[PDB]
């Protein structure tokens, strides 16, 4: 299973003219490109090592796609402004994301595409990829404009043929990395809270992909975690980190196990401290 997703963001700026436009591309949990109409070089540019051996032909085209999207989105922000009867003074956000996913066979499993205005679902592309559906009541005129114009087809073509095709080329270019599973380095830390209790915190460091799951269990096992769990976070070197903590009665530490589940480990590791 692999995916190729892009995230597009356009933010209006009443004062400073043209709204900011940003695009980032990912292959699974690895960002490989980006575009920013506000940086030194508007260009789609490389953001992963395995993308520095590409020619002008590639960068010019993607740059063209990013720039065209930006211009349309400029127009769309004025349009969306008219729909919510919002004044020209405030700043607003138009978001667009699209992606294709492969199944194990390595072939097209599914595709997706949706727009959002000011952080809310606006227009979504149907599961079969053959028509649109307004998710926000205010997006209904866009749904018809779009279905009548038959715009889903060009998106479906892209999601099934182009996206998938390139997802394959990308995995091949960055195989050394992209296909390698990096399991987590693990351990449980002990942090006394008082003379009665103490927090048991299980660590998972430097793993990839991001998906992982840590589960505390002690043991007359009614339920039951009540665990403090932080959002899986990026180490900054391409890998991820996470931990799950609980409060144990002092002396009762050892009755606790932390189960670590991830793709890169031949099977789940169990931690006790």
């Amino acid at each position: 299973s692999h995916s190729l997703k892009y995230f597009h963001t356009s933010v209006s700026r009443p004062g400073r003219g043209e709204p900011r436009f940003i695009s980032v591309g990912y292959v699974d949990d690895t960002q490989f490109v980006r575009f920013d109409n506000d940086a030194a070089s508007p260009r789609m540019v490389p953001r992963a090592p395995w993308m520095e051996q590409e020619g002008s032909e590639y960068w010019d085209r993607e740059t063209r796609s990013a720039r065209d999207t930006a211009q349309i989105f400029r127009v769309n922000l004025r349009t969306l402004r008219g729909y919510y009867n919002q004044s020209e003074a405030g700043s607003h956000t138009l978001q667009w994301m699209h992606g294709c996913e492969l199944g194990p066979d390595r072939r097209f499993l599914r595709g997706y595409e949706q727009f959002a205005y000011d952080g809310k679902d606006y227009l979504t592309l149907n599961e079969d990829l053959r028509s649109w559906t307004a998710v926000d009541t205010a997006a209904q005129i866009s749904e018809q404009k779009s279905n009548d114009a038959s715009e889903a087809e060009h998106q479906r073509a892209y999601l099934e043929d182009t996206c998938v095709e390139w997802l394959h080329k990308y995995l091949e270019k960055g195989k050394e990395t992209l296909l390698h599973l990096e399991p987590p380095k693990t351990h449980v830390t002990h942090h006394p809270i008082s003379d009665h209790e103490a927090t048991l915190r299980c660590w998972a460091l430097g793993f990839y992909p991001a998906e992982i799951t840590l589960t505390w269990q002690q043991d007359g096992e009614g339920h039951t975690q009540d665990t403090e769990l932080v959002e899986t976070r990026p180490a900054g070197d391409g890998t991820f980190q996470k931990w799950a903590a609980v409060v144990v009665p002092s002396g009762e530490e050892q009755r606790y196990t932390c189960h670590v589940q991830h793709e890169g480990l031949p099977e789940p590791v169990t931690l006790r401290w």
Binding site: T79, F115, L123
Partner: peptide, 9 residues
Amino acid sequence: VMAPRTLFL
């Protein structure tokens, strides 16, 4: 590559 076409909302 990214979608070469988008929607005019």
